[PDB]
Amino acid sequence: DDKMNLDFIKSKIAAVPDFPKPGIMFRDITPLLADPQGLRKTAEAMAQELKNKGIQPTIVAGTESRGFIFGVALAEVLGLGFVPVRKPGKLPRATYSVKYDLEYGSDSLEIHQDAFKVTDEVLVVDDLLATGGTAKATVDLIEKTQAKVAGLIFVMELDGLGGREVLAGYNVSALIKF
Amino acid sequence: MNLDFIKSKIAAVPDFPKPGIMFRDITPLLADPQGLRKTAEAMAQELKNKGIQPTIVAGTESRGFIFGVALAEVLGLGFVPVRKPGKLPRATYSVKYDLEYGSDSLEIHQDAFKVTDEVLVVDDLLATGGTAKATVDLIEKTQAKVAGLIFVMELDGLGGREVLAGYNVSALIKF
Ligand SMILES: Nc1ncnc2[nH]cnc12
Ligand SMILES: Nc1ncnc2[nH]cnc12
């Protein structure tokens, strides 16, 4: 049944050549999203992996924006709250901020200082693990609140781009690997 | 009781983004373990009370992805992201909307909807309606139909509803 669910999720991810630049094979979640069971089966597969691993978060965090999609769907399945990790300048009350490296330049993410209780074990959700830059900035952000990271889970991991190493010391799951 | 619960988790924040504006902050609603499911359930009740039976949900990047996903799940429907520019990888339609100064765009994949779809737009807030109207227009470039638009919140007097003249508009709460 787990292979079967995983095969369904895999069967809805398109591969798109040369996007956003030449040479990059883009992994496209839109057909998964569009299917009436796509999000639900994805979030149920995520819950199964977490259960297998004994990971029991208290709340879910997602980054702007595809963290919002899968994070909200997973939060629903687990009966948990959700916290947005936003681009800078969007959150209205006091925030923490963490800068991360891009190929050229840098950027930041923020969370409300009060987003997590100090007893929270936070599950980070996102679509795709590549370099792990925004995932690590997310972990740092959570830790600023004094809450603890329960783990990180992705729909997809890109083999060999170093994300999982960047996230050493944290439990990392990914449903599909490319 | 349900609407009151949702209202009670939308914090009022003075002077954001700038002196004078009263910001309506959904974060405490999102953090509550029942905030999103209650919100989605209240939206689904509204749509049944108005006879709107969409075939697919479109959520506006980025807070419409939050409420859109939640409501799509309650409805048993699929979800289409309406995205900021340069994010969707396949052939897209594009529509411009006005910002304070200059403009920006929203995109959808040209294959996101069929001619037979009846699309529900979901977003957190109806303010000027700039983005919501661009979304309607995107939808209509596919020749699918707009079933309706639903928002958590509507800001009274900013003209949003009027910009969306001719479409079925619902908002859970008016501020
Ligand atoms: N190759 C890729 N496909 C889809 N999303 C991405 N985000 C970063 N790299 C990506
Ligand atoms: N006043 C407001 N409060 C919350 N979100 C908004 N988006 C635009 N105006 C807003």
From TrEMBL, chain A:
Q: Which GO terms describe its molecular function?
A: adenine binding; adenine phosphoribosyltransferase activity; AMP binding
Q: Pfam families from the entry?
A: Pribosyltran
Which positions fall inside the Phosphoribosyltransferase domain? 32-156
Among NCBIfam families, the record links this protein to: apt, PRK02304.1-3, PRK02304.1-5
Q: Please give the function described in this protein's UniProt entry.
A: Catalyzes a salvage reaction resulting in the formation of AMP, that is energically less costly than de novo synthesis.
Q: Identify the main location.
A: cytoplasm
**What name does UniProt use for this protein?**
Adenine phosphoribosyltransferase
The annotated subunit structure for this chain is:
Homodimer.
Q: Name one GO biological process term.
A: adenine salvage
Give the family from UniProt. Belongs to the purine/pyrimidine phosphoribosyltransferase family.
Question: Its pathway?
Answer: Purine metabolism; AMP biosynthesis via salvage pathway; AMP from adenine: step 1/1
Give the reaction(s) catalysed.
AMP + diphosphate = 5-phospho-alpha-D-ribose 1-diphosphate + adenine
Q: Name one GO cellular component term.
A: cytoplasm
Name of the gene encoding the protein in the UniProt record: apt
For this protein, the record's HAMAP family field holds: Aden_phosphoribosyltr
Its localization reads:
Cytoplasm
Q: What is its EC number?
A: 2.4.2.7
| Alphabetized UniProt keyword annotations | Cytoplasm, Glycosyltransferase, Purine salvage, Transferase
Q: Which Gene3D superfamilies match?
A: 3.40.50.2020
